[PDB]
Amino acid sequence: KSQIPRLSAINDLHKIWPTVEEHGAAIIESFLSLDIVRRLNEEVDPFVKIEPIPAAKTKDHPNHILSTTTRLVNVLAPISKAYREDVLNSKVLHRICSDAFHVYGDYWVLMGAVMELAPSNPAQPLHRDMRFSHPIVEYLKPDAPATSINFLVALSPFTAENGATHVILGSHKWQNLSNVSMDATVRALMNPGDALLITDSTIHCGGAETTGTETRRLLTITMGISQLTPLESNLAVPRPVIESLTPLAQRLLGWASQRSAAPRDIGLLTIRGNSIEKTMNLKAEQPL
Amino acid sequence: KSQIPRLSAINDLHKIWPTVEEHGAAIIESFLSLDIVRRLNEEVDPFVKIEPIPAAKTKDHPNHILSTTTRLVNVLAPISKAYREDVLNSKVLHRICSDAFHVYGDYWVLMGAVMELAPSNPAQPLHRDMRFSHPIVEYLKPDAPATSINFLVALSPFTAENGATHVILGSHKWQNLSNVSMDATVRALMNPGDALLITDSTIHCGGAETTGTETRRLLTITMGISQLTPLESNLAVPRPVIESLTPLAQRLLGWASQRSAAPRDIGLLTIRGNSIEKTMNLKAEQPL
Numbered sequence: 001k002s003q004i005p006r007l008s009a010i011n012d013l014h015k016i017w018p019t020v021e022e023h024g025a026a027i028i029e030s031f032l033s034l035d036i037v038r039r040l041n042e043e044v045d046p047f048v049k050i051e052p053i054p055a056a057k058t059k060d061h062p063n064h065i066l067s068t069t070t071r072l073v074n075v076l077a078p079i080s081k082a083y084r085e086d087v088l089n090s091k092v093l094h095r096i097c098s099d100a101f102h103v104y105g106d107y108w109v110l111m112g113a114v115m116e117l118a119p120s121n122p123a124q125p126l127h128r129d130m131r132f133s134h135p136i137v138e139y140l141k142p143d144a145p146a147t148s149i150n151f152l153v154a155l156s157p158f159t160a161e162n163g164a165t166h167v168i169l170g171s172h173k174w175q176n177l178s179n180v181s182m183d184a185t186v187r188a189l190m191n192p193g194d195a196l197l198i199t200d201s202t203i204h205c206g207g208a209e210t211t212g213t214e215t216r217r218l219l220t221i222t223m224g225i226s227q228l229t230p231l232e233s234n235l236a237v238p239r240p241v242i243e244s245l246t247p248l249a250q251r252l253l254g255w256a257s258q259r260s261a262a263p264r265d266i267g268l269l270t271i272r273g274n275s276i277e278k279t280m281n282l283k284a285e286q287p288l
Numbered sequence: 289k290s291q292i293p294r295l296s297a298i299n300d301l302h303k304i305w306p307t308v309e310e311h312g313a314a315i316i317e318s319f320l321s322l323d324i325v326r327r328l329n330e331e332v333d334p335f336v337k338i339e340p341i342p343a344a345k346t347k348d349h350p351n352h353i354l355s356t357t358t359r360l361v362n363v364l365a366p367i368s369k370a371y372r373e374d375v376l377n378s379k380v381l382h383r384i385c386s387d388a389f390h391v392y393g394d395y396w397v398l399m400g401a402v403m404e405l406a407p408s409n410p411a412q413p414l415h416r417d418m419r420f421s422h423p424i425v426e427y428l429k430p431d432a433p434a435t436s437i438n439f440l441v442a443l444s445p446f447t448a449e450n451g452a453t454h455v456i457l458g459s460h461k462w463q464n465l466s467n468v469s470m471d472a473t474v475r476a477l478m479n480p481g482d483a484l485l486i487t488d489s490t491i492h493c494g495g496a497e498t499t500g501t502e503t504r505r506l507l508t509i510t511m512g513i514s515q516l517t518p519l520e521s522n523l524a525v526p527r528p529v530i531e532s533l534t535p536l537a538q539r540l541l542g543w544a545s546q547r548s549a550a551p552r553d554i555g556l557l558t559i560r561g562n563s564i565e566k567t568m569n570l571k572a573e574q575p576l
């Protein structure tokens with residue numbers, strides 16, 4: 001069976017989205033630099049350590065899906081300078097997203113999360129994303145362009161033995177799922193900073209951690225059209241932090257109005273014909 | 289041709305959504321009381337008067353669709369006590385919305401707007417709503433349940449001569465639009481407080497104002513699944529105003545997290561497994 005196509009973030013940029021469109025997955029080598037990965041890891045470290053189980057009794061929105069050996073931390077903008085500056089303004093991310101979502105219009109972050117899998121974490125069942133938050137997606141026609149995509153960025157090594165992600169190539173075009181099996185999968189073997197890019201229709205799963213010693217970490221960035229509601233809110237992020245961001249990063253976090261691709265677009269999150277940012281006196285790129 | 293079915297808000301409540309599901313439209317008689325209509329009108333009056341043309345050069349999100357004789361005012365919560373208290377907590381509205389959207393989960397306000405049409409306002413072209421903001425909707429399968437609905441509430445009389453809304457009954461099920469004509473329409477003749485309820489697939493239009501003297505006004509409430517982004521933002525509404533509202537009204541305006549209907553729903557607009565309202569210390573029902 002054919003492996004996941006691998007591409008350069010530096011040279012093959014225009015080829016990334018067409019590759020995913022065809023195969024349902026691609027590995028973007030050095031999507032983030034080792035320096036960005038280092039700072040990201042340092043900044044999120046304590047928040048991963050304090051995170052309780054996904055379905056903790058203290059939560060009003062528990063995640064009953066994820067294993068007890070998974071820790072997921074979202075709303076990263078207030079935690080991580082590297083995320084809010086470097087990741088949210090990534091030239092590579094934005095080229096891919098504009099390639100993917102031009103039919104629909106503006107896109108934003110549905111969820112940016114660090115996931116850490118403890119040693120001996122079991123394999124997830126094969127799945128498509130978005131089914132526990134956006135039931136609407138299952139009612140889209142088969143030829144509808146993908147309305148979200150997921151960048152799974154390695155923040156530590158992804159190996160066969162430590163639970164590297166499985167994907168089924170071509171499964172983004174599957175209508176009948178009688179042939180879903182781990183037999184049909186290939187692995188996303190990745191170094192820190194590499195990214196596995198999949199669509200919301202790509203069948204995939206986290207792999208089994210089999211060493212009992214290694215802790216695998218990733219940054220999952222689900223980017224989606226601004227017509228779909230994010231999984232996470234940035235409504236409680238302090239205004240000083242938001243005002244430190246670029247206008248583009250503000251838009252990605254829902255601190256700006258949005259536009260569809262319709263010729264005479266009337267807009268999303270508008271206030272009597274004016275934008276959020278105009279109405280609220282919203283500054284940008286103001287150092288903290 | 290058969291007229292738009294008319295129903296009581298008081299007696300026929302359970303029949304309203306099934307009627308719209310079958311015919312694509314229904315008139316809800318006395319949806320709002322004359323007292324609510326009176327207060328609504330009084331409170332929005334000055335904001336309608338100051339509203340510039342839909343595509344005013346001062347706007348960064350101009351509406352190039354609506355006629356120059358249309359005035360539309362959205363984000364009504366800060367303007368109108370009657371809207372934020374009586375309309376947003378309407379028992380009738382909430383029964384209909386929960387009937388309509390149970391397959392998907394929580395619903396919220398995509399836009400609540402007062403529209404005032406000046407004398408001699410021309411008929412709008414026949415259309416479906418949502419095509420200038422949510423291109424995603426056109427890619428839904430034909431049998432997908434409606435993802436938004438629109439309550440067109442008369443705030444003044446709707447007559448044949450003053451431009452009462454036209455609808456084509458059954459047009460919510462049309463795939464081929466070769467037979468779209470004003471010949472196929474019937475009128476929503478309504479007294480103040482009556483509501484025309486349509487789906488996002490119902491073909492309809494504003495009528496021609498032919499008297500040259502009458503000013504027609506309506507309250508349009510587009511309710512949609514919480515998975516779709518609103519046309520309007522309440523992000524700039526003062527916290528005292530938001531904290532005066534019921535928890536249900538807060539949710540409708542995007543000042544709460546949301547849930548899908550998936551068995552083990554993971555939620556929308558969540559903050560690390562917790563809701564907006566829990567995270568932000570959000571009070572409710574605090575008098576202004």
Ligand SMILES: CN1C(=O)c2ccccc2NC(=O)[C@@H]1Cc1ccccc1
Nearest residue numbers: 065066124125127128129130131132220
């Ligand atoms: C449930 N679930 C998440 O929580 C998740 C986590 C990170 C990024 C995306 C994301 N979206 C999802 O739909 C997944 C789906 C899933 C996960 C494990 C096992 C079965 C299904």
Ligand SMILES: CN1C(=O)c2ccccc2NC(=O)[C@@H]1Cc1ccccc1
Nearest residue numbers: 353354412413415416417418419420508
């Ligand atoms: C453009 N447009 C609005 O502005 C509008 C106004 C009030 C409530 C819903 C709404 N949504 C829409 O999609 C309509 C569509 C339309 C209007 C006039 C002529 C052709 C098409």
Ligand SMILES: O=C(O)CCC(=O)C(=O)O
Nearest residue numbers: 129164165204205206207
């Ligand atoms: O652990 C992984 O590599 C995949 C995680 C995933 O697909 C998910 O949680 O949705």
Ligand SMILES: O=C(O)CCC(=O)C(=O)O
Nearest residue numbers: 417452453492493494495
């Ligand atoms: O004017 C009316 O009654 C209908 C208005 C309408 O359909 C619209 O603006 O979308």
Ligand code: NI
Nearest residue numbers: 127128129204
């Ligand atoms: Ni997944």
Ligand code: NI
Nearest residue numbers: 415416417492
């Ligand atoms: Ni309309």
